Design a protein around this ligand. Structure first.
Ligand SMILES: [Ca+2]
Ligand SMILES: [Ca+2]
Length: 293
DNA sequence: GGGTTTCCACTTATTCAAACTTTTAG
DNA sequence: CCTAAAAGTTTGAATAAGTGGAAACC
């Protein structure tokens, strides 16, 4: 358990790493032929188990378990504890397209609260909700409820509510790089990025205006597209990016990366990145951050 | 119970984060 | 000539999302 987490930071982290789930399972023992499970979950590398424990003690709900050999998950499916999930995201709402999945999570909750999921009509309604939730219905499930079921939902278009949301979100999707551009041989270039699918291009473009710096570049890995918000101008990094996250502390192992990233920022501010000894200090910091930690 | 809920082990991609090099700006 | 800033490239894996199995619970 230990340290508690700021609710807006938590909402930002959920916008990045969270996921809502609605299981509609074939069940011979169910009077209606199907059983259900509803909840919310976060899966992270083992190195960030403390985040899941901090979230757990912030809400006082959820179960932590291994997720393979290198990951760990927090899952909330106990029905009464879903009220906590609902109460949090009502007070601290999501702003990515995942908000649409939360809204469906709510509809499914209402059905199950009335116990309608134990009847034919309630299961049917849960199939309709799941058709729009995340990756939708399997072919088997779709064929089991023969009816014109829409897969579309309202697109979410909301603005960053505050710097705390950005800290939680950046704690998930952010990246702090000490780029060693290979005449001392090396030009140290600090880089800050935030990655996200094109489905939230509106949100990504606002980062430029919201933070007053940076560029947007599109990426394409075969049939997959995503956006990268990138800042490299030192003064923007020193005056606009660093103070934001100094004032709104990151969580997880990435905080150490930001801290080291700030050490190099101070060396650069003092021109020591142009000295042989200063450069050696920077190369040593870089080796022990991000994947090298 | 007998139907239902909750938990635990584990899988599967792709959307991420991350690392690297080349060119242009001032 | 020099350092900074920006454009550019590449991809592994930590994510997001999910399933099987069954103990536990009402
Ligand atoms: Ca995400
Ligand atoms: Ca992350």
């Amino acid at each position: 358990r230990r340290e508690s987490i700021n609710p807006w930071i938590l909402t930002g982290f959920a916008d990045a790493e969270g996921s809502f789930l609605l299981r509609i399972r074939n069940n011979n023992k169910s009077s209606v032929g199907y059983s259900t499970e509803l909840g919310f979950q976060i899966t992270l590398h083992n190195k960030d188990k403390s985040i899941l424990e901090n979230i757990q003690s912030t809400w006082k709900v959820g179960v932590i378990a291994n997720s393979g050999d290198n990951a760990v998950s927090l899952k909330v499916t106990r029905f009464e504890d879903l009220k906590v999930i609902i109460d949090h995201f009502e007070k601290y709402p999501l702003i990515t397209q995942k908000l649409g999945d939360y809204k469906l999570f709510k509809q499914a909750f209402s059905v199950m609260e009335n116990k309608e999921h134990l009847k034919e009509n309630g299961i049917k309604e849960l199939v309709r909700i799941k058709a729009k939730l995340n990756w939708g219905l399997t072919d088997e499930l779709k064929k089991a409820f023969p009816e014109n079921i829409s897969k579309e939902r309202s697109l979410i278009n909301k603005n960053i509510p505050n710097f705390k949301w950005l800290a939680g979100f950046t704690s998930g999707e952010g990246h702090f790089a000490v780029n060693l551009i290979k005449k001392l041989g090396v030009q140290v270039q600090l880089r800050f990025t935030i990655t996200q699918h094109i489905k939230d291009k509106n949100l990504m473009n606002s980062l430029i205006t919201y933070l007053g710096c940076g560029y947007i570049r599109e990426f394409n890995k075969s049939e997959f597209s995503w956006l990268e918000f990138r800042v490299t101008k030192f003064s923007d990094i020193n005056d606009k990016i660093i103070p934001v996250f100094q004032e709104n502390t990151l969580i997880g192992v990435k905080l150490e990366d930001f801290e080291d990233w700030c050490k190099v920022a101070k060396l650069i501010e003092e021109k020591k990145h142009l000295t042989e000894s200063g450069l050696d200090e920077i190369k040593k910091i870089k080796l022990n951050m991000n994947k090298g930690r």
